[PDB]
Amino acid sequence: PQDLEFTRLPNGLVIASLENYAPASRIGLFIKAGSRYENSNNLGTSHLLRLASSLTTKGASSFKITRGIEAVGGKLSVTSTRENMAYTVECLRDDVDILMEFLLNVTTAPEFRRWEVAALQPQLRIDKAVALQNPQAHVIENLHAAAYRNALANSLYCPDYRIGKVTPVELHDYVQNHFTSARMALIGLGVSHPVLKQVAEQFLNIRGGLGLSGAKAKYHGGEIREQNGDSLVHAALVAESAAIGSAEANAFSVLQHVLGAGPHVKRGSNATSSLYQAVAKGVHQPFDVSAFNASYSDSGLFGFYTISQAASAGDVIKAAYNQVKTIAQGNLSNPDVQAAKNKLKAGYLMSVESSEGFLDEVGSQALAAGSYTPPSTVLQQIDAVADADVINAAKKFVSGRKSMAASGNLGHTPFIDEL
Amino acid sequence: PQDLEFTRLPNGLVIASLENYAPASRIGLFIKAGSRYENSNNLGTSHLLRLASSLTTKGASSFKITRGIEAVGGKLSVTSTRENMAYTVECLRDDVDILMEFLLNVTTAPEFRRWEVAALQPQLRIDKAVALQNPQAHVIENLHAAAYRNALANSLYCPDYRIGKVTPVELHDYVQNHFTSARMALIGLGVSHPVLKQVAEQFLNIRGGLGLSGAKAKYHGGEIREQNGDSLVHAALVAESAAIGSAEANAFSVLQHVLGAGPHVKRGSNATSSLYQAVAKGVHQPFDVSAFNASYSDSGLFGFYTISQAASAGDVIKAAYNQVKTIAQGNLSNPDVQAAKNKLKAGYLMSVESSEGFLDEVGSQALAAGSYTPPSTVLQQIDAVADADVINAAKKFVSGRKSMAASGNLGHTPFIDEL
Amino acid sequence: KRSVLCRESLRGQAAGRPLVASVSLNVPASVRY
Amino acid sequence: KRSVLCRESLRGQAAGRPLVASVSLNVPASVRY
């Protein structure tokens, strides 16, 4: 009924709200600290920070925090990316208040106690181990540290050597510099904006400029190769995408989808995916491949991802390249761009068809832009992409510094000079 | 009294002998199997082989073999490099026969039992662990794997993920293909050549062509970077040296020494070392740096090594480079080449002033050339280097594809584009 | 570990706003794109 | 682990024939250059 309602304060923190119909409300304070905010000396700190959400804080003891949310059946999620750190908080309409006071302690009143922080430590390993079970994570991580030099090249998981070395003043410092007013954006999916603001005003007024971590971007082509014993090999080939929320970017996204192979059908094969077709024809029976597309504030990464077997690595890898070269040679017919587009458009809408989705979308926008762009408008922008435009972007991957990451038996994985 | 005595057989194995005066004789069968002989599927099998030298074989049980040599106070060393694998055997004049029949079993009659080879496995980790304690080893190793692509970029030490997976058939196959007649060179320091031959003839006649592992060379510029928490940072910078036992090579060697900083004086600083001087002037108080120089059959690596602190890494690194740039700009006066030379000459002589040294030198030559070059001749060759030649070779580093490997806190370590 | 032998492979990463987003929650836990 | 704080550092690798030669012996054991 009522649409969202942004509001930038004197501090510069955004806040939105949508009194929905349904029973479940979800707040989520998105602070602007990503992994990119640590240095050589501070790497691994967000990670631990992320895992230390239920520790004692100034107004609520680790026990009350946990037992409290349990009391009411609430969930507290603490999600991060290379650029941002969403601190989600779900619960029942009636219990927001008990919950909110929890979110506020966790985030503005953390008390990292030598003893508490210390017992966590070991959790980092356990967490790293469980997320490093998907080749995608170690490759995708390897990719970012190869392709960048300094900031976004920092990984989300703490480096093995750092684990126990994460000290309490580190955590305290990171919160202090990054968990501040200018970098924050409250977001409610079932709360009153009037009452939201009041609270925001009372509890979210802290000072801290950007880049006390060392903000800045930079792209550097590079290759990280990880040999294994596994039959299968994964590798990523990616060139500087266009930046976040800009036209070039957007173009990339559309291009991405013309090749982009994220199955829309169970047990079904893509007819639409060019990459898949081209790869497929020159490739063996079992294999899988898809268009990769990442976009951040000050840089992007576009290119593809492959999963081939030992001997097929190159064949697939080049195959995929060659096909994306085709689009860069100019060869791309109108009929396919419109399909793409509609694919994209449908996806973005389904992305936001859920509370969780919507809440992310909104906060996300509040840290980039400073306001909420409605869907429609969104939809318009993607449509504005020219059929050429797409080609042109594509032209840029083929003619843009390469950067690859692979894993598995690398006898048959092309190097930079190979392609 | 009697000088060495080489003899190539019909098989193509080389054998030498020097009845010396003194009480200690030492055999050493050098088989041509280095770490460069393994593939993606075979990596870490030389390593295990190196460590399995006391296992049961056809004529001698592991127990007999070890208690046997103990009996007599012998030592059995199994040394290996990326290109070769020396199997050393020391003991008392009177006991060479008991000992030789051990070397023969160990090398031509290995019996890798599932159970025995399985117990070892864990030794690999222990061995790897102790050797990786010296930054030199992991950096040096990382160097080879970045500068090469296929063969010499294989490290000496088993890859973590392979350890328990090195199978018996693997050992049996590596022995079979590489531990063969054409690749072998016997070498005695206190044995009769007449009686050596006999034995060599009776026990070392096995067939096996080269490259069933996949022999071939190739250089590829690359950078492997290992972040740590250690104050100090090590880094290597190296471009394709000239090959083994060739003029260019030799040149490099001499240039190496002009900059080469291996202290000849305890607690003493080099006045000779250009690199050191130059580095020193632009550098802080505590630091250390040395010219690196590697030469193998089918390629080389020449360039320098640095050990700086976190914020000096670059300064040092560049400083070193610049100075080696100087020589390649032509700036190098005669006085310094002759000192260098004499430094090198001195060095080689001392290198061969020991039994162990001599026996390595001899075998080594056996595997490369096919005969023993006397010292004198050696000495002449090094002298032939031209004062320009040196510069010319140095020109090549500066104008040769770069390849670097660093460890430690890498905030201040130049990348390829940095220098 | 889950065997990845067949045609079924369909994992590659690329979403709209979020990319490689790692969750750690008091109750559940995961890795997405 | 041995502290490497002073001027003493003098480790860097480069020999004649041998380069990065690792020994494993029945009795002793090591890593040279």
PDB file of N, CA and C in Angstrom, chain A residues 339-376:
ATOM      1  N   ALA A 339      15.925 -11.171 -26.448  1.00  0.00           N
ATOM      2  CA  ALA A 339      15.696 -12.336 -25.582  1.00  0.00           C
ATOM      3  C   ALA A 339      16.463 -12.079 -24.279  1.00  0.00           C
ATOM      4  N   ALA A 340      17.773 -11.942 -24.467  1.00  0.00           N
ATOM      5  CA  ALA A 340      18.660 -11.604 -23.363  1.00  0.00           C
ATOM      6  C   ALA A 340      17.893 -10.656 -22.446  1.00  0.00           C
ATOM      7  N   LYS A 341      17.708  -9.437 -22.936  1.00  0.00           N
ATOM      8  CA  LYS A 341      17.082  -8.373 -22.166  1.00  0.00           C
ATOM      9  C   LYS A 341      15.946  -8.878 -21.295  1.00  0.00           C
ATOM     10  N   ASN A 342      14.979  -9.502 -21.956  1.00  0.00           N
ATOM     11  CA  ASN A 342      13.818 -10.053 -21.268  1.00  0.00           C
ATOM     12  C   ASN A 342      14.255 -11.063 -20.221  1.00  0.00           C
ATOM     13  N   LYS A 343      15.194 -11.943 -20.583  1.00  0.00           N
ATOM     14  CA  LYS A 343      15.770 -12.811 -19.549  1.00  0.00           C
ATOM     15  C   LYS A 343      16.179 -11.931 -18.373  1.00  0.00           C
ATOM     16  N   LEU A 344      17.153 -11.041 -18.543  1.00  0.00           N
ATOM     17  CA  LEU A 344      17.566 -10.164 -17.451  1.00  0.00           C
ATOM     18  C   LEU A 344      16.373  -9.625 -16.685  1.00  0.00           C
ATOM     19  N   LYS A 345      15.484  -8.891 -17.333  1.00  0.00           N
ATOM     20  CA  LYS A 345      14.366  -8.192 -16.718  1.00  0.00           C
ATOM     21  C   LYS A 345      13.566  -9.142 -15.826  1.00  0.00           C
ATOM     22  N   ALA A 346      13.279 -10.320 -16.386  1.00  0.00           N
ATOM     23  CA  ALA A 346      12.514 -11.318 -15.620  1.00  0.00           C
ATOM     24  C   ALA A 346      13.265 -11.666 -14.338  1.00  0.00           C
ATOM     25  N   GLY A 347      14.539 -12.045 -14.446  1.00  0.00           N
ATOM     26  CA  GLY A 347      15.413 -12.258 -13.304  1.00  0.00           C
ATOM     27  C   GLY A 347      15.390 -11.137 -12.302  1.00  0.00           C
ATOM     28  N   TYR A 348      15.799  -9.912 -12.636  1.00  0.00           N
ATOM     29  CA  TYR A 348      15.758  -8.854 -11.625  1.00  0.00           C
ATOM     30  C   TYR A 348      14.433  -8.798 -10.875  1.00  0.00           C
ATOM     31  N   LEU A 349      13.313  -9.087 -11.531  1.00  0.00           N
ATOM     32  CA  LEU A 349      12.019  -8.973 -10.865  1.00  0.00           C
ATOM     33  C   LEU A 349      11.813 -10.099  -9.887  1.00  0.00           C
ATOM     34  N   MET A 350      12.195 -11.308 -10.328  1.00  0.00           N
ATOM     35  CA  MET A 350      12.118 -12.448  -9.408  1.00  0.00           C
ATOM     36  C   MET A 350      13.105 -12.273  -8.264  1.00  0.00           C
ATOM     37  N   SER A 351      14.252 -11.657  -8.531  1.00  0.00           N
ATOM     38  CA  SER A 351      15.219 -11.339  -7.490  1.00  0.00           C
ATOM     39  C   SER A 351      14.516 -10.571  -6.376  1.00  0.00           C
ATOM     40  N   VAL A 352      13.667  -9.625  -6.741  1.00  0.00           N
ATOM     41  CA  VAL A 352      13.032  -8.771  -5.751  1.00  0.00           C
ATOM     42  C   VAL A 352      11.653  -9.242  -5.369  1.00  0.00           C
ATOM     43  N   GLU A 353      11.225 -10.407  -5.874  1.00  0.00           N
ATOM     44  CA  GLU A 353       9.900 -10.897  -5.516  1.00  0.00           C
ATOM     45  C   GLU A 353       9.804 -11.422  -4.100  1.00  0.00           C
ATOM     46  N   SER A 354      10.895 -11.498  -3.348  1.00  0.00           N
ATOM     47  CA  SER A 354      10.864 -11.920  -1.961  1.00  0.00           C
ATOM     48  C   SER A 354      11.293 -10.867  -0.948  1.00  0.00           C
ATOM     49  N   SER A 355      10.794 -11.013   0.286  1.00  0.00           N
ATOM     50  CA  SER A 355      11.170 -10.045   1.323  1.00  0.00           C
ATOM     51  C   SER A 355      12.687  -9.930   1.348  1.00  0.00           C
ATOM     52  N   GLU A 356      13.339 -11.069   1.594  1.00  0.00           N
ATOM     53  CA  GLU A 356      14.785 -11.071   1.708  1.00  0.00           C
ATOM     54  C   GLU A 356      15.421 -10.400   0.505  1.00  0.00           C
ATOM     55  N   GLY A 357      14.929 -10.746  -0.667  1.00  0.00           N
ATOM     56  CA  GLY A 357      15.468 -10.168  -1.895  1.00  0.00           C
ATOM     57  C   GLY A 357      15.294  -8.655  -1.888  1.00  0.00           C
ATOM     58  N   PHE A 358      14.063  -8.214  -1.737  1.00  0.00           N
ATOM     59  CA  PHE A 358      13.730  -6.802  -1.692  1.00  0.00           C
ATOM     60  C   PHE A 358      14.605  -6.033  -0.716  1.00  0.00           C
ATOM     61  N   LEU A 359      14.669  -6.511   0.523  1.00  0.00           N
ATOM     62  CA  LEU A 359      15.466  -5.879   1.557  1.00  0.00           C
ATOM     63  C   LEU A 359      16.922  -5.713   1.123  1.00  0.00           C
ATOM     64  N   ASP A 360      17.460  -6.752   0.482  1.00  0.00           N
ATOM     65  CA  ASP A 360      18.842  -6.630   0.026  1.00  0.00           C
ATOM     66  C   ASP A 360      18.850  -5.545  -1.046  1.00  0.00           C
ATOM     67  N   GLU A 361      18.044  -5.733  -2.093  1.00  0.00           N
ATOM     68  CA  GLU A 361      18.025  -4.764  -3.169  1.00  0.00           C
ATOM     69  C   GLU A 361      17.994  -3.344  -2.641  1.00  0.00           C
ATOM     70  N   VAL A 362      17.055  -3.082  -1.742  1.00  0.00           N
ATOM     71  CA  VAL A 362      16.958  -1.731  -1.222  1.00  0.00           C
ATOM     72  C   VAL A 362      18.194  -1.242  -0.513  1.00  0.00           C
ATOM     73  N   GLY A 363      18.656  -1.962   0.501  1.00  0.00           N
ATOM     74  CA  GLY A 363      19.851  -1.498   1.221  1.00  0.00           C
ATOM     75  C   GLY A 363      20.975  -1.248   0.223  1.00  0.00           C
ATOM     76  N   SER A 364      21.213  -2.259  -0.615  1.00  0.00           N
ATOM     77  CA  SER A 364      22.229  -2.207  -1.636  1.00  0.00           C
ATOM     78  C   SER A 364      22.268  -0.854  -2.344  1.00  0.00           C
ATOM     79  N   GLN A 365      21.102  -0.416  -2.799  1.00  0.00           N
ATOM     80  CA  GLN A 365      20.910   0.829  -3.524  1.00  0.00           C
ATOM     81  C   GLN A 365      21.211   2.021  -2.628  1.00  0.00           C
ATOM     82  N   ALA A 366      20.850   1.868  -1.351  1.00  0.00           N
ATOM     83  CA  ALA A 366      21.105   2.982  -0.447  1.00  0.00           C
ATOM     84  C   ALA A 366      22.583   3.241  -0.222  1.00  0.00           C
ATOM     85  N   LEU A 367      23.436   2.222  -0.275  1.00  0.00           N
ATOM     86  CA  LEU A 367      24.876   2.444  -0.129  1.00  0.00           C
ATOM     87  C   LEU A 367      25.500   2.953  -1.420  1.00  0.00           C
ATOM     88  N   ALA A 368      24.940   2.619  -2.577  1.00  0.00           N
ATOM     89  CA  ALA A 368      25.496   3.103  -3.831  1.00  0.00           C
ATOM     90  C   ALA A 368      25.077   4.545  -4.132  1.00  0.00           C
ATOM     91  N   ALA A 369      23.815   4.681  -4.502  1.00  0.00           N
ATOM     92  CA  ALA A 369      23.145   5.875  -4.940  1.00  0.00           C
ATOM     93  C   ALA A 369      22.793   6.867  -3.850  1.00  0.00           C
ATOM     94  N   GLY A 370      21.936   6.462  -2.916  1.00  0.00           N
ATOM     95  CA  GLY A 370      21.530   7.372  -1.839  1.00  0.00           C
ATOM     96  C   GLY A 370      20.010   7.429  -1.746  1.00  0.00           C
ATOM     97  N   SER A 371      19.384   6.614  -2.585  1.00  0.00           N
ATOM     98  CA  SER A 371      17.934   6.560  -2.677  1.00  0.00           C
ATOM     99  C   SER A 371      17.483   5.260  -3.348  1.00  0.00           C
ATOM    100  N   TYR A 372      16.170   5.040  -3.289  1.00  0.00           N
ATOM    101  CA  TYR A 372      15.619   3.865  -3.926  1.00  0.00           C
ATOM    102  C   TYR A 372      15.122   4.143  -5.335  1.00  0.00           C
ATOM    103  N   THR A 373      15.781   3.586  -6.342  1.00  0.00           N
ATOM    104  CA  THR A 373      15.228   3.516  -7.685  1.00  0.00           C
ATOM    105  C   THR A 373      14.161   2.417  -7.794  1.00  0.00           C
ATOM    106  N   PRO A 374      12.949   2.737  -8.172  1.00  0.00           N
ATOM    107  CA  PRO A 374      11.881   1.757  -8.366  1.00  0.00           C
ATOM    108  C   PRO A 374      12.226   0.803  -9.496  1.00  0.00           C
ATOM    109  N   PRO A 375      11.567  -0.339  -9.538  1.00  0.00           N
ATOM    110  CA  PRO A 375      11.745  -1.402 -10.506  1.00  0.00           C
ATOM    111  C   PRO A 375      11.589  -0.891 -11.929  1.00  0.00           C
ATOM    112  N   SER A 376      10.374  -0.440 -12.224  1.00  0.00           N
ATOM    113  CA  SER A 376      10.093   0.144 -13.529  1.00  0.00           C
ATOM    114  C   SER A 376      11.284   0.880 -14.113  1.00  0.00           C
TER     115      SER A 376
END
